[PDB]
Amino acid sequence: MAHEEDGVCNSNAPCYHCDANGENCSCNCELFDCEAKKPDGSYAHPCRRCDANNICKCSCTAIPCNEDHPCHHCHEEDDGDTHCHCSCEHSHDHHDDDTHGECTKKAPCWRCEYNADLKHDVCGCECSKLPCNDEHPCYRKEGGVVSCDCKTITCNEDHPCYHSYEEDGVTKSDCDCEHSPGPSE
């Protein structure tokens, strides 16, 4: 979509949103945005899944990892470094139910983080302003809040428990209304 906001994105024509960056700077669109921008005051070279900084009124934003940066945002293929890969192989095996950005249990927020050769999809932090995506406090290499989409959400029964394991961003089948709700945290 398009909406008047800071920086150069989805201003009034070039409708281009940014995964976590967009939802963190301007939530009013959904597309692949990424480009350097810094005159001599701020920095804006984020990406739908990288480690950069946006230009927010004398306030630079913190994105995920562009190649090898310890961040909890729009992952990029194998977001993270060596250690990260070792923590994902052991963390995913014990929390396979975290194959996406979801969270609704007595625990913190989780997101799809892993590196392997197979057919999969982007993590939750790499999702757009979906109709079922908010943002809860994730627990990784640093306490913080990240976008939370619908997928491995907990079960609404005798207790909150992730449904299963899968990496797929929540999608609707109406597109006949303003699908742009608000988070809780």
Measured distance CA(103)–CA(110) in Å, rounded: 6
Calculate the dihedral angle through the C-alpha atoms of 17, 20, 24, 29, rounding to the nearest 10 degrees. 20
Which structure tokens are listed for 27? 């939530």
**Which two structure tokens, joined as six digits, stand for 34?**
């990424």
By three-state DSSP, how is residue 162 classified?
strand
97 vs 22: CA distance, rounded Å: 27
Query: Which structure tokens are listed for 58?
Result: 């004398």
Where the chain is discontinuous (C–N > 2.5 Å), the residues before each break are none
Residue written as tokens 């999969």?
120
3-state SS class at 146: strand
Least Cα distance to 164 among 174, 172, 153 occurs for 153
Contact present, 146 and 111 (Cβ < 8 Å):
yes
Method of structure determination:
NMR
| β-pair type (144-146, 136-138) | antiparallel
Number of domains in the chain: 1
The answer to whether 111 and 124 are in contact (CB under 8 A) is yes
Of 156, 145, 142, the C-alpha closest to 101 is: 145
CA atoms of 153 and 55, how far apart (whole Å): 33
Task: Report d(CA 66, CA 141) in Å as an integer.
Answer: 16
Range of the domain at 82: 1-185
| Sign of the CA dihedral running 59, 63, 68, 69 | positive
| Alpha-carbon span 42 to 154, nearest angstrom | 40
Q: Is 19 helix (H, G, I), strand (E, B) or coil?
A: helix
Looking at residue 96, what DSSP letter applies?
T
Tokens 């095996």 belong to 93
